[PDB]
Amino acid sequence: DVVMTQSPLSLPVTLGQPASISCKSSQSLLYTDGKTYLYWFLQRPGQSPRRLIYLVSKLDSGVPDRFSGSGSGTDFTLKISRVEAEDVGVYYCLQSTHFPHTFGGGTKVEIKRTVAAPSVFIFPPSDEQLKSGTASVVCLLNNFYPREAKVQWKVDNALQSGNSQESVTEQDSKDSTYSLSSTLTLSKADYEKHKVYACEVTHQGLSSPVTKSFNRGEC
Amino acid sequence: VQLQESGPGLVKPSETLSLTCTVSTSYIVDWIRQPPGKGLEWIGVIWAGGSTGYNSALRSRVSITKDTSKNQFSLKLSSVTAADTAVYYCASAAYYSYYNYDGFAYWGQGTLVTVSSASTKGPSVFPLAPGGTAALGCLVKDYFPEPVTVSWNSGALTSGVHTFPAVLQSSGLYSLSSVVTVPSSSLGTQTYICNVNHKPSNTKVDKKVEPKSC
Ligand SMILES: Cn1c(CNc2ccc(C(=N)N)cc2)nc2cc(C(=O)N(CCC(=O)O)c3ccccn3)ccc21
After folding, report:
1. Which of B32, B51, B90, B107 should be mutated for ligand 1, with most atoms under 8 A from CB?
2. Do residue B80 and residue B126 come from a single domain?
3. Which of A86, B68, B122, B210 is a good FRET partner for A157, with 20 to 30 A between their CA atoms?
């Protein structure tokens, strides 16, 4: 099988600057009809891959002229003349000159924007959930940059471990930020044994860590 | 060119995965898959005229066929295991002639297929109740398989919405949160409802989100 080596894996770029993505094939991609079946796609978060380029350098209808493709034989490049916020996502090269057809590993373009502190919000479990025997406590970190953030759960000032899960959004196509949700899960019995529920957030945008808290039962 | 993709989103291990792709010339149709959080893998092709080509990595478990009269294409993958869990895509391109054909020009919306012996389970929806900005949301808990879709105010509220990737709990059920930031001044006047849809269990839940009563 033809190995398609794509580089870099991660591509942080300043808004308005050019970008270059390399795709190197282990075999010539020149077919017997004189055509080179090398394609490029952009996969935006939660969307299907969308074709940008085909036949190395041909732009699909509707694709902005900021995108261009070049190369021959084994070394190919996708260039973006001036990166825009909506260009974030994962770019893939593909060869179909040889069977089986093979894709590059992908390149994730990230906008390197200014530091943005997260806005922190805490949510107690609903009375509806408490009736079912479980308590989910949610901490939200909204619209921050860079991605690096730490969430620490405290219950009556005791550090929690192994009872939380978190997930992070992909970089926003408009404001270039991330958001994160952390859920602390306890049994109703364990939840009722304690008073102070707190979420402590550490991030570059915060001069000192931010703690959001509530006292169980208070409206 | 529009591509409609259909098929079960849950398949038991050892059973056959079946997907359908309808194109609305002639066409060349390719199938591609993407395991969660990973890259793209090419599965196979059906050429204009019916010739096929498959990825040897599928160890001859794969079949692609075209309906005799319509541009409808079927993907069959036998003896599935958890390694076959992925979003499956069909992609088409024009076949003008033997000297002018293309590939991967138009892609369908993907179909997630989860290979599991577990039963479908609808979610429970709980409110995440709230100067100058307020946050609110919905916790969509204990469902299987993925995905769930969440909208706010029947699609009228899109700005400031963040629907997080689901997490798999130790119970083997998924949990997801959807949040929205709004002006704190809007809380007394504007109604906020999260619309949750879980197609595998045919569950549709509308949850009004408001502060807890004092
Ligand atoms: C490697 N390769 C290319 C490179 N370009 C290319 C563009 C796009 C795509 C793509 N869309 N996947 C795939 C490749 N073109 C090819 C045409 C044939 C072919 O004509 N036969 C016979 C067709 C019949 O007998 O009628 C065929 C076709 C499919 C399978 C098996 N055999 C074989 C191999 C080819």
Report:
1. B51
2. no
3. B210
CA distance B4 to B24: 8
Q: What own/partner pairs with CB < 8 Å and gap ≥ 24 does B49-55 have?
A: B53/A99, B53/A100, B54/A100, B55/A100, B55/A101
- Interatomic CA distance for residues B191 and B189, integer angstroms: 7
Among residues B98, B117, B136, which one ends one of the domains? Answer: B117
Resolution (Å) of this entry: 1.7
Tracing tokens 């995905």 back to the chain, one arrives at B147
Which experimental method was this entry solved with?
Answer: X-ray
Q: B162, A165: Cβ pair inside 8 Å?
A: no
Q: Which residue carries 């090419």 as its tokens?
A: B42
Q: Structural domain of residue B85, as residue ranges?
A: 1-117
Give yes or no: residues A144 and A81 share one domain.
no
Q: Domain total for chain B?
A: 2
Measuring CA to CA, which residue among B45, B18, B43 is closest to residue B29? B45
Q: Which tokens in the block code for residue B210?
A: 């408001």
Give the mutation target among A41, A98, A99 for probing the ligand 1 site: most ligand atoms within 8 A of CB: A99
SS3 content of chain B, % helix, strand, coil (to 5): 5, 50, 40
CATH assignment of the domain containing B25: 2.60.40.10
Residue with tokens 């074709």: A51
